[PDB]
Amino acid sequence: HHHHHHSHMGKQASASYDSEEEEEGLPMSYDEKRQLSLDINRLPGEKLGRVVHIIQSREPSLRDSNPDEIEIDFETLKPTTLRELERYVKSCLQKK
């Protein structure tokens, strides 16, 4: 009497990518405004120069009024604007 055992535990893999590269501009939730704030607050003054510059390009009122003290208002800022802050800070934190 000899013995052999057999079994095939076949589990499916998963790989998914977005088809487009469009400005999704989804309704940015309250917490994602905070998520930018903490992660931008840890960026050096050099990066803070570009961080505000894109906001001042969106808000020409604050651009012209104050080139010295700049208040980034995330809550009213457009999800298309904050898209740049998100992808940029993420590119500073991660090698991406």
Binding site: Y30, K33, R34, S37, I40, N41, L43, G45, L48, G49, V52, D68, E69, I70, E71, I72, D73, F74, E75
Partner: peptide, 23 residues
């Protein structure tokens, strides 16, 4: 280059003023 500012929280966690600081 410039006088080094700091990013500071303006009341709300959704507002940050980069105040005019000396390096």
């Amino acid at each position: 280059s410039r006088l080094t500012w700091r990013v500071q929280r303006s009341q709300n966690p959704l507002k940050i003023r980069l105040t005019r600081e000396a390096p």
